C-alpha cells in the first residue's frame, strides 16, 4: 500500500497474506477470498500459504495454513469477474469478513490493508499496512481508464485529483471495506488492478463485490 500507515495487531484480524503475494479475507476460517488474478485456475492446490493471525509475518505467533484446493470464478479471463476462493486444510481461528450483497455501501470513504509495496517498483512489507482511500465514481475511473473498465463489475476508489495513496503490487486481493449500518466492518472490494500505484488520473480498481457476492457464497458451500 503506497501511502499507508501500520495497522494495529488485531485491528483487522481478518486479514490473510497469501504465498504468491497476495492478500486475502477470511470469508470463514477456512475459506480466503482473494483475487482471481492471484490463482492459475480451479482444482485441488495444496501448494499456497496463508499466513493469518497477525501483523507482522516474521512474529512466532503467524499461523501457517496451506491450501487444498482453489475455486477461481467461472469464465476468468482478465476481463472482470476477479475473484477466488481458497479453501484451507485448516482453519485460522479469527474473526471473518462479511461480504456485501447490496450496492447500499458502494460509496464512502473505504479502507484497505495490505503487504504489498509502498512505492513503485518497491519491495514487500513485512508488516500490515492500511490507508483509508474514497469512494471514485465509475464515470471518473472511466475518464482514466476508458473501455478497460467492466461496468458493474469494478468499483474504484483513490484520490483521482491527487492520487497519494493506493494498493499496489503485492495487495492483490486483499479486501476494500467500510461500516455497514450495524456498525461492523463489511466488504465492498477486492484489489484488483491500477495504472502505476498512487498516480494522479488513475484512481485504484476493485472487484465489485456487491456483484458477485451470490456466486461468491454459492460457490463456497461447495468447497
Ligand atoms: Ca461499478
Same mark, same amino acid.
Given at each position: 500500500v503506497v501511502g499507508g500507515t501500520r495497522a494495529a495487531q488485531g485491528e483487522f484480524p481478518f486479514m490473510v497474506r497469501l504465498s504468491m503475494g497476495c492478500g486475502g479475507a477470511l470469508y470463514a476460517q477456512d475459506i480466503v477470498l482473494t483475487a482471481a488474478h492471484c490463482v492459475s485456475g480451479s482444482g485441488n492446490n495444496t501448494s499456497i500459504t496463508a499466513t493469518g493471525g497477525v501483523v507482522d509475518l516474521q512474529s512466532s505467533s503467524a499461523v501457517k495454513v496451506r491450501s487444498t484446493k482453489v475455486?477461481?470464478?467461472?469464465? +476468468?479471463?482478465?476481463?472482470?469477474?476477479?475473484?477466488?476462493?481458497?479453501?484451507? @486444510?485448516? !482453519?485460522?481461528?479469527? !474473526?471473518?469478513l462479511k461480504i456485501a450483497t447490496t450496492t447500499a455501501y458502494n460509496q464512502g470513504?473505504? &479502507? $484497505?490493508?495490505?503487504?504489498?509495496?509502498?512505492?513503485?517498483?518497491?519491495?514487500?512489507?513485512? +508488516?500490515?499496512?492500511?490507508?483509508?482511500?474514497?469512494? $471514485?465514481?465509475?464515470? @471518473?475511473?472511466?475518464?482514466? +481508464?476508458?473501455?478497460?473498465?467492466? @461496468?458493474?463489475?469494478e468499483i474504484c476508489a483513490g484520490y483521482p485529483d491527487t492520487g497519494g495513496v493506493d494498493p499496489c503490487q503485492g495487495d492483490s486481493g486483499g479486501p476494500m471495506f467500510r461500516k455497514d449500518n450495524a456498525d461492523e466492518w463489511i466488504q465492498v472490494g477486492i484489489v484488483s488492478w491500477g495504472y502505476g500505484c498512487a498516480r494522479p488520473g488513475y484512481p485504484g480498481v +476493485?472487484?465489485? $463485490?456487491? &456483484?458477485?457476492?451470490?456466486?461468491?457464497?454459492?460457490?463456497?458451500? &461447495?468447497?
Open positions: 475455486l477461481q470464478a467461472p469464465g +476468468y479471463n482478465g476481463t472482470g469477474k476477479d475473484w477466488a476462493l481458497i479453501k484451507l @486444510a485448516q !482453519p485460522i481461528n479469527q !474473526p471473518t470513504t473505504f &479502507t $484497505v490493508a495490505g503487504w504489498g509495496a509502498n512505492r513503485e517498483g518497491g519491495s514487500q512489507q513485512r +508488516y500490515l499496512l492500511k490507508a483509508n482511500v474514497p469512494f $471514485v465514481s465509475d464515470a @471518473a475511473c472511466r475518464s482514466a +481508464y476508458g473501455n478497460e473498465l467492466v @461496468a458493474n463489475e +476493485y472487484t465489485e $463485490v456487491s &456483484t458477485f457476492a451470490s456466486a461468491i457464497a454459492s460457490a463456497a458451500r &461447495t468447497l
